[PDB]
Design an enzyme around this catalytic site. Structure first.
Site, PDB file in Angstrom:
ATOM      1  N   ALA A  78       0.821  -1.234   0.000  1.00 40.70           N
ATOM      2  CA  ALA A  78       0.000   0.000   0.000  1.00 40.70           C
ATOM      3  C   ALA A  78       0.844   1.268   0.000  1.00 40.70           C
ATOM      4  CB  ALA A  78      -0.941   0.041   1.200  1.00 40.70           C
ATOM      5  N   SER A 105      -1.985  -2.616  -5.177  1.00 42.85           N
ATOM      6  CA  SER A 105      -2.841  -2.466  -3.985  1.00 42.85           C
ATOM      7  C   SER A 105      -4.145  -1.705  -4.256  1.00 42.85           C
ATOM      8  CB  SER A 105      -2.095  -1.708  -2.883  1.00 42.85           C
ATOM      9  OG  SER A 105      -2.930  -1.553  -1.767  1.00 42.85           O
ATOM     10  N   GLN A 127      -4.918  -6.319  -6.451  1.00 44.57           N
ATOM     11  CA  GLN A 127      -5.218  -6.836  -5.133  1.00 44.57           C
ATOM     12  C   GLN A 127      -6.496  -6.155  -4.681  1.00 44.57           C
ATOM     13  OE1 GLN A 127      -6.146  -6.265  -1.243  1.00 44.57           O
ATOM     14  NE2 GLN A 127      -4.774  -4.670  -2.007  1.00 44.57           N
ATOM     15  N   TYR A 129      -9.683  -5.491  -1.968  1.00 38.31           N
ATOM     16  CA  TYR A 129     -10.350  -5.555  -0.665  1.00 38.31           C
ATOM     17  C   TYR A 129     -11.843  -5.508  -0.901  1.00 38.31           C
ATOM     18  CZ  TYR A 129      -6.224  -5.160   2.243  1.00 38.31           C
ATOM     19  OH  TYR A 129      -5.017  -5.393   2.876  1.00 38.31           O
ATOM     20  N   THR A 155      -7.908 -10.293  -0.998  1.00 38.83           N
ATOM     21  CA  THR A 155      -7.400 -10.485   0.361  1.00 38.83           C
ATOM     22  C   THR A 155      -8.541 -10.967   1.265  1.00 38.83           C
ATOM     23  OG1 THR A 155      -5.756  -8.818  -0.053  1.00 38.83           O
ATOM     24  CG2 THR A 155      -6.128  -9.425   2.247  1.00 38.83           C
ATOM     25  N   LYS A 233      -5.929 -14.669  -1.351  1.00 40.54           N
ATOM     26  CA  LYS A 233      -4.755 -14.223  -0.664  1.00 40.54           C
ATOM     27  C   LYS A 233      -4.970 -14.096   0.857  1.00 40.54           C
ATOM     28  CE  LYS A 233      -1.636 -10.156  -0.581  1.00 40.54           C
ATOM     29  NZ  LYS A 233      -1.757  -9.674   0.859  1.00 40.54           N
ATOM     30  N   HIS A 257       0.046 -11.930   5.436  1.00 37.88           N
ATOM     31  CA  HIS A 257      -0.142 -10.523   5.207  1.00 37.88           C
ATOM     32  C   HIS A 257       1.122  -9.838   5.724  1.00 37.88           C
ATOM     33  CE1 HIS A 257      -3.367  -7.258   4.733  1.00 37.88           C
ATOM     34  NE2 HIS A 257      -2.298  -6.570   5.086  1.00 37.88           N
ATOM     35  N   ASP A 288       4.003 -15.440  -0.299  1.00 37.72           N
ATOM     36  CA  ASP A 288       4.718 -14.198   0.086  1.00 37.72           C
ATOM     37  C   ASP A 288       5.120 -14.250   1.565  1.00 37.72           C
ATOM     38  OD1 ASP A 288       2.525 -13.023   1.603  1.00 37.72           O
ATOM     39  OD2 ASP A 288       1.747 -12.081  -0.194  1.00 37.72           O
ATOM     40  N   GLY A 290       8.644 -12.868   3.933  1.00 36.64           N
ATOM     41  CA  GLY A 290      10.017 -13.189   4.276  1.00 36.64           C
ATOM     42  C   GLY A 290      11.004 -13.431   3.131  1.00 36.64           C
ATOM     43  N   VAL A 291      10.579 -13.269   1.887  1.00 36.45           N
ATOM     44  CA  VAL A 291      11.462 -13.537   0.749  1.00 36.45           C
ATOM     45  C   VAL A 291      12.481 -12.416   0.623  1.00 36.45           C
ATOM     46  CG1 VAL A 291      11.606 -13.835  -1.771  1.00 36.45           C
ATOM     47  CG2 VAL A 291       9.693 -14.942  -0.476  1.00 36.45           C
ATOM     48  N   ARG A 292      13.764 -12.731   0.796  1.00 40.85           N
ATOM     49  CA  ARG A 292      14.860 -11.712   0.710  1.00 40.85           C
ATOM     50  C   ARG A 292      16.025 -12.167  -0.152  1.00 40.85           C
ATOM     51  NH1 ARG A 292      10.909  -9.779   2.526  1.00 40.85           N
ATOM     52  NH2 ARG A 292      10.598  -8.982   4.646  1.00 40.85           N
TER      53      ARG A 292
HETATM   54  C1  LIG Z   1       3.890  -1.650   3.840  1.00 42.52           C
HETATM   55  C2  LIG Z   1       3.012  -2.844   3.496  1.00 42.52           C
HETATM   56  C3  LIG Z   1       1.784  -2.626   2.883  1.00 42.52           C
HETATM   57  C4  LIG Z   1       0.987  -3.716   2.544  1.00 42.52           C
HETATM   58  N1  LIG Z   1      -0.231  -3.458   1.948  1.00 42.52           N
HETATM   59  C5  LIG Z   1      -1.089  -4.512   1.583  1.00 42.52           C
HETATM   60  C6  LIG Z   1      -2.321  -4.241   0.962  1.00 42.52           C
HETATM   61  O1  LIG Z   1      -2.681  -3.087   0.709  1.00 42.52           O
HETATM   62  N2  LIG Z   1      -3.162  -5.305   0.602  1.00 42.52           N
HETATM   63  C7  LIG Z   1      -2.782  -6.644   0.852  1.00 42.52           C
HETATM   64  O2  LIG Z   1      -3.511  -7.585   0.545  1.00 42.52           O
HETATM   65  N3  LIG Z   1      -1.563  -6.895   1.476  1.00 42.52           N
HETATM   66  C8  LIG Z   1      -0.703  -5.840   1.852  1.00 42.52           C
HETATM   67  N4  LIG Z   1       0.540  -6.125   2.466  1.00 42.52           N
HETATM   68  C9  LIG Z   1       0.983  -7.544   2.594  1.00 42.52           C
HETATM   69  C10 LIG Z   1       1.760  -7.899   1.292  1.00 42.52           C
HETATM   70  O3  LIG Z   1       0.870  -8.104   0.144  1.00 42.52           O
HETATM   71  C11 LIG Z   1       2.686  -9.121   1.445  1.00 42.52           C
HETATM   72  O4  LIG Z   1       1.918 -10.209   1.922  1.00 42.52           O
HETATM   73  C12 LIG Z   1       3.900  -8.922   2.347  1.00 42.52           C
HETATM   74  O5  LIG Z   1       4.479  -7.596   2.257  1.00 42.52           O
HETATM   75  C13 LIG Z   1       4.956  -9.932   1.917  1.00 42.52           C
HETATM   76  O6  LIG Z   1       5.919 -10.084   2.923  1.00 42.52           O
HETATM   77  P1  LIG Z   1       7.303  -9.329   2.811  1.00 42.52           P
HETATM   78  O7  LIG Z   1       6.927  -7.811   3.184  1.00 42.52           O
HETATM   79  O8  LIG Z   1       8.111  -9.883   4.009  1.00 42.52           O
HETATM   80  O9  LIG Z   1       8.044  -9.473   1.547  1.00 42.52           O
HETATM   81  C14 LIG Z   1       1.380  -5.042   2.837  1.00 42.52           C
HETATM   82  C15 LIG Z   1       2.628  -5.259   3.449  1.00 42.52           C
HETATM   83  C16 LIG Z   1       3.439  -4.156   3.774  1.00 42.52           C
HETATM   84  C17 LIG Z   1       4.787  -4.402   4.441  1.00 42.52           C
END
Ligand SMILES: Cc1cc2nc3c(=O)[nH]c(=O)nc-3n(C[C@H](O)[C@H](O)[C@H](O)COP(=O)(O)O)c2cc1C
Ligand SMILES: Cc1cc2nc3c(=O)[nH]c(=O)nc-3n(C[C@H](O)[C@H](O)[C@H](O)COP(=O)(O)O)c2cc1C
Ligand SMILES: Cc1cc2nc3c(=O)[nH]c(=O)nc-3n(C[C@H](O)[C@H](O)[C@H](O)COP(=O)(O)O)c2cc1C
Ligand SMILES: Cc1cc2nc3c(=O)[nH]c(=O)nc-3n(C[C@H](O)[C@H](O)[C@H](O)COP(=O)(O)O)c2cc1C
Lengths: 359, 359, 359, 359
Positions: A78, A105, A127, A129, A155, A233, A257, A288, A290-292
């Site tokens: 987001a 997002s 994505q 909501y 989501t 998701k 998430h 998704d 933890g992928v680094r």
């Molecule tokens: C700053 C931030 C914003 C996110 N915004 C959304 C969102 O708007 N909608 C959603 O379904 N997931 C959101 N997520 C979850 C991500 O889609 C994703 O699952 C997650 O970032 C993956 O893990 P990672 O940050 O460790 O790579 C957000 C995560 C972060 C860190």
């Protein structure tokens, strides 16, 4: 010189204001799942095959019938314009250069239309909501279809927002010049003009706008509403994955998430095998959280994921150098994944198999 | 006074330039396997027998039909002249004094011929890389045969070089006065005269010279090429070990290349039992990776290894006091192994058995 | 105010010279078993019974047919006069006051005769080393019989001394005024008049005097030599425990010699159940190693030990306040054990059972 | 701003005198169970269901046939007036506001009568200790009945007080102006006028007043004595839980007395499932020990507890802001539990099930 993804976060903290850094960084509550999303990948060990001929390692694959340059795609972070002025538009352009896909997002600081215009030839998905107002939800889906988006990732794990402690201490909310560009009203655009009180502005936003009654009935509605592929998701259980398949959905994105919803759930890499098993080959499964590193990508694919999504590193790329920074993060991950594939005896993604990993 | 192997590393960091220290020290990427190579040995516990009569503990054994003073031998550390002016020649002379064997790196800063001349009566083997140019590979094998080398250890886990982060930050490459002495061209001798750019000079060297297409076909070629014993170095899987035996090879060296190739593979002591089992008594199995103490040697032999190889401690010996330093490191390990054997009820290496260990 | 055993070590380091403190403190090599002797006790959890009537908790028991006030006895710490001028004589007097037993070291700084004279009514046993000179060994056994010692604890895990790193760095040896009082020659009395070189003076002492050929044949000899109960000290394996019973021995002391011999053996509390099982009710089993708390004593007894021995805390008592300090350490352990017994539903030692513990 | 329970302890240490802070904070001995009560909750992972419709999450439930606003109730923390002038009366008023229940300590600094007067409409139960003087015990039970208390929670794990090290170093005892208000004599009121020597004043209090002979016979007496529901508090074993049910008791409170009695017992969340199983649906089971977060409450209920009790956080609320502070702590826990329920797919407490957790 930033040479690995860890380097990027390190740098992002130095440049972003605390509120914005904390918002992106945070997990929910005590952040147990946050740490675990990372630590879990280390527990799965690799068993590489030797002497397999890996001279021309091909990273190419497909997501939901669309070709990608690598099984590494951009997840729906987001409000990207908080990290870089160019926000989501820098991101889509990097994705266009890489040949990989971008999930946009619902809470983007750039519109569905804006993003399609900046990356017309980029693979893009939305994505979604589910809003209390179903007309708002319908509008997002219709705009994604109109604009050449190729799937909906709904989501399903946010009936309310998780409690991220820093966001409440910081009274998190968008900087004065920014909005959730997919919406027209003050409320639904997350206008920072509102005084949100003594809590997270985002927790209030969601409580007011997002429907906590979300059920499988709404999934049935959404499935009848669009002929686009739909991916669930936020699924963490095999019996829920089964239910998704039964509702005629086309994929599962294993996600907690980014550790920002319910704390104390398992790492995504740990639940992935139970979901892959529950789905019985019927639908593609992604991961998704933890992928680094390139080895993280290898592990998820050995365990049966088609592709993985990258969340925070993208924001950290954005914060370092905008489009180029996102491009560089994606290129680092690509070459790490190539090296890891080759060292494990894998010429292409199709010969990645689960004998490569053991916990 | 340096009284244990840990003492030596401690000291080596104080004297070596950072680039050279980091090169020798490093693991790949986040260095998970690096830590694990050590931590794993601690998890295997010892179950000593008492009252066995251990008055004249005999450490003598054999490697591939050749007698050694102890089941502790020198592994193929590249470019030793970066640690000490005398490099590989100090090493072979120490091995000659000890009565144990030295594996010479293809990437040695001293030639196959030079080393044989400095240690004519020392047991010596050649660690082989398969070059894109097969004439270069053939030449190394022929020179080893001519010079009284008693086996070939082919490395099978380096189709490309692992990503060691410090080497890229440091832009690692040989000091101006040194070369890979087994080669005559600028390219193949790793001439520091080249500008290697913004990465490891060694990663580029390998990408240009070393054949990523290496397969079991090349193993068949190598087996027909020499009547010397051939050992497969870098095997981590039982099904690959089986394949080696089938190709007519004479040993397996269980190695994760000192944790410098694919990160997140298991510790060598942890995979050793699966390899010993896969090989069904047909061929001798050795181990390298994490050996620092006499009890490490005991554990590997209880688990079925014939002998172990020592990598980094040799370099640290070299860096402290050249030949004498390598000799002293080897004598420390010898007397630690003798003490550990005696305390566990083992008069000689043949009564070492697997009831001595449990994980 | 020192109120727990940990308090005592803390204090002992502040008063003892480093060489003497390090000698008593040390484990062998990297000290893995040293840490584990303690950490292991924590892993065994307690399952207390409630409402059992514990109004008059009776700690009394017996060791080898002799009554003791509590199943907590003094183990054979060498050379106690390094900690306190009164050394072993302070210790025996504390044991006499407590109503518990003292095992006297062969390497005591006070003679077998001296100790009997200072604690005539104290329960006393002799810890025996088997000397190269069998006349010396015989003499110790005969002197123990003459002086009212009630058993022989033969140490079976020291064919050579473990490698304690600090003792070698410190060039450990007795202060000029002290000797191993059980011997008359310079060599056998560990005379500090000798220059022991660049290593532990104790490692040399043992290498010269103590017979590394020790076997079950020597056990047969010792069994024919004395009608005293004999306990095998240092056994860590079930098959060795079986052998002891077969040789007509009267007990097993599960010990890893305070983590000072072979490093990387299990914690004593961890091997205790396998020994209790191997012995099939035939002989009493004791434990030493890591005992610092009353709950440690409870755990060892639930797992089937008759009594435990206390090593280092006794030295730390000695170093704080001589006889009174040893007495106070023993009284702390006694009241901790009483409290732990009562809280777990145990009125007396006979109702301690293994349902009280699970790992 | 204090936004989570951890925030409160942090603050409580800053305001309370050390003796009073240490008394409330402490575990027994080395505090292993203390740490584990917390760490154990983290090991149980959550498996949330999605898309269940959680729009009106109802936290309401019942304890022993009495309705409560949430399955989160106040446990019997002794001597609350040490934390706040208003002590137990602030607590009951907060409970009255919340619609949840308060267990009153036998060792309260406010009388059974005082508390009923300050919270006439609050759900209140009495935590009972069995005194040497049975007339004193009878009097407490009769006063609780007279004053509208709705159950007796008999503590069964304190035949003697645990050894809390800080209380002995601090010579813990009540400040001059305070007493155990349920008693009239100097002895039984824990009068600080006494000189308790070189130990905990509370350990002496209990040794003098509380009957270590407590047995199942006393349970039989208590059951005949009152028609109030009786709950056994302190049970950690399935066979004891079975015995309680057989004696006609109406509940089990799984408790290790806040880690303050026998150290080295398991975490309460870890023993809870064995107790729930042993009780075979016959009686309600509760849990205390380590509850700090809404997810802790969810985990205990998924594992079969009807309700949980909160100990230390209540004292920390008291110490921050008296009644309001206790109310705020309880409201934080309530909203954390609501969020955790909703995120896991649970509309109400009856659909919480054990598939939600795995260890
Ligand atoms: C700053 C931030 C914003 C996110 N915004 C959304 C969102 O708007 N909608 C959603 O379904 N997931 C959101 N997520 C979850 C991500 O889609 C994703 O699952 C997650 O970032 C993956 O893990 P990672 O940050 O460790 O790579 C957000 C995560 C972060 C860190
Ligand atoms: C500085 C260094 C250079 C090495 N060079 C080679 C090499 O040229 N060829 C090869 O097959 N392995 C090479 N290795 C791996 C070693 O043969 C060996 O597997 C490893 O050093 C053993 O682990 P240890 O360093 O923990 O003792 C190298 C390792 C190090 C640390
Ligand atoms: C300073 C010291 C001296 C010891 N001397 C002897 C000895 O002379 N003979 C023997 O059999 N064991 C000896 N031991 C081992 C002890 O008998 C015992 O196994 C150990 O101290 C118990 O462990 P604890 O020190 O953790 O309580 C010694 C241990 C220490 C620490
Ligand atoms: C300061 C303090 C006083 C306590 N007093 C009593 C008591 O008087 N009677 C009793 O049965 N338990 C007593 N307990 C144990 C509690 O009833 C409860 O089991 C424990 O506090 C719950 O764990 P928690 O503190 O981690 O929330 C006390 C615990 C504390 C910390």
């Amino acid at each position: 010189r930033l040479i690995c993804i860890n380097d990027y976060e390190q740098h992002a903290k130095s440049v972003l204001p605390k509120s914005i850094y904390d918002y992106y960084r945070s997990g929910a509550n005590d952040e147990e799942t946050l740490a675990d999303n990372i630590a879990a990948f280390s527990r799965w060990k690799l068993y590489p095959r030797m002497l397999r001929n890996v001279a021309e390692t091909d990273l190419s694959t497909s997501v939901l019938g669309q070709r990608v340059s690598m099984p590494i795609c951009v997840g729906a972070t987001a409000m990207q314009r908080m990290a870089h002025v160019d926000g989501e538009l820098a991101t889509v352009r990097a994705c266009q250069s890489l040949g990989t896909g971008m999930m946009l997002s619902s809470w983007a600081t750039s519109s569905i239309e804006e993003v399609a215009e900046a990356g017309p030839e980029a693979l893009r998905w939305l994505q979604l909501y589910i809003y209390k107002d179903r007309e708002v939800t319908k509008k997002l889906v219709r705009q994604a279809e109109k604009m050449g988006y190729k799937a909906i990732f709904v989501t399903v794990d946010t009936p309310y927002l998780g409690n991220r402690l820093d966001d409440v201490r910081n009274r998190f909310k968008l900087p004065p010049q920014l909005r959730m560009k997919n919406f027209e009203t003050s409320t639904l655009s997350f206008s920072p003009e509102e005084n949100f009180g003594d809590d997270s502005g985002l927790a209030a936003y969601v409580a007011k706008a997002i429907d906590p009654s979300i059920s499988w009935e709404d999934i049935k509605w959404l499935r009848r509403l669009t002929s686009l592929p739909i991916v669930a998701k936020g699924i963490l259980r095999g019996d829920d994955a089964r239910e998704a398949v039964k509702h005629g959905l086309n994929g599962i994105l294993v996600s907690n998430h980014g550790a920002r919803q319910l704390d104390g759930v398992p790492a995504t890499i740990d639940v992935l095998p139970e979901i892959v098993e529950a789905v019985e080959g019927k639908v593609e499964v992604f991961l998704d959280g933890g992928v680094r590193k390139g080895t993280d990508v290898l592990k998820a694919l050995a365990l049966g994921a088609k592709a993985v999504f990258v969340g925070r590193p993208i924001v950290w790329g954005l914060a370092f150098q905008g489009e180029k920074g996102v491009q560089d993060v994606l290129e680092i991950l690509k070459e790490e994944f190539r090296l890891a594939m080759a060292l494990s005896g894998c010429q292409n993604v199709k010969v990645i198999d689960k004998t490569l990993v053991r916990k």
